[PDB]
Design a protein around this ligand. Structure first.
Ligand code: 56K
Ligand code: 56K
Lengths: 161, 161
């Protein structure tokens, strides 16, 4: 079932989400299902549970190919100090984008919805997607990470590199 | 004549605008006319020439009542250090607003379009309008001034005080 995505300004995006405690359950599998379906309908590459007003450490993401992934209780570790700049947008902030520095290299861990452990090293766009989605679990959106406000604007208008 | 307002992302918002050198001219009077008309059609309280892609130190503003004012070659001086927070939006960033600290007290100077000198002390919302419009003359938009990103979001969604 497609869920409503809440937009920046909604307090439910600003919460720190608790862990998932229902790995392998039918209730989680359905919620994950709905999230992939919601992500797909909005043409997203990532979506976090709080963007559909569900307060849980859960995100889906994927589609350079990033693997289709559902991830509960994510925890992330930079693998280096190299930052890298890249374009980011967000379905809760429709029509806009900005350039955001993210770690180029991370490891992330947590659990697939059937409860199997997940751990991967990630780089570049894959890395950036997971960091962005992780931010939501923590009440954080990308504008608070912009350093060059010249690169922030509407998508159909922007012309920076 | 109503002009197109350009949106955040357009480089023409990021320029430092040169002075007006045509006070008392028919070309300025028409441009000022168009700006009041453009401001009115968009339900703005302020609009700066670069928001209609005209690169000049010129702004209109007004409607607590703020007097309807056209102002070329604005220069501003805080009258104190008291900052004050207030809600701001911007016609080049439609649908959004944020809380922004501005000086509570300013003096501003420059010229009415007929070339008569203008100087006023200003406080509160009047002050804030002029500071906001002044920012555009200098390539600056309000997001780069947000300190609490919790208060930044879509207007129809937001619920902070
Ligand atoms: C090239 C682009 N990437 C994105 C994007 C980047 C990181 C995270 C999410 N959720 C979206 C928007 S435009
Ligand atoms: C209460 C509000 N004020 C504004 C506003 C405030 C300052 C400058 C401009 N141009 C608009 C938007 S919502």
């Amino acid at each position: 079932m497609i869920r409503d995505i809440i937009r920046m300004g909604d307090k439910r995006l600003l919460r720190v989400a608790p862990q998932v405690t229902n790995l392998g359950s039918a209730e989680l599998h359905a919620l994950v299902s709905d999230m992939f379906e919601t992500m797909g309908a909005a043409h997203g590459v990532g979506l976090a549970a709080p963007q559909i007003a569900v307060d849980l450490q859960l995100m889906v993401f994927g589609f350079p190919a990033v693997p289709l992934t559902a991830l509960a209780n994510a925890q992330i570790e930079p693998l280096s100090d190299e930052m890298e700049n890249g374009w980011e947008g967000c379905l809760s902030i429709p029509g806009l984008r900005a350039v955001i520095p993210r770690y180029r290299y991370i490891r992330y861990r947590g659990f697939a919805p059937d409860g199997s452990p997940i751990e991967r090293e990630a780089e570049g766009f894959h890395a950036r997607v997971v960091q962005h989605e992780y931010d939501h679990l923590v009440g954080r959106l990308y504008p608070s990470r912009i350093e060059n406000f010249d690169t922030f604007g509407f998508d159909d208008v922007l012309s920076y590199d």
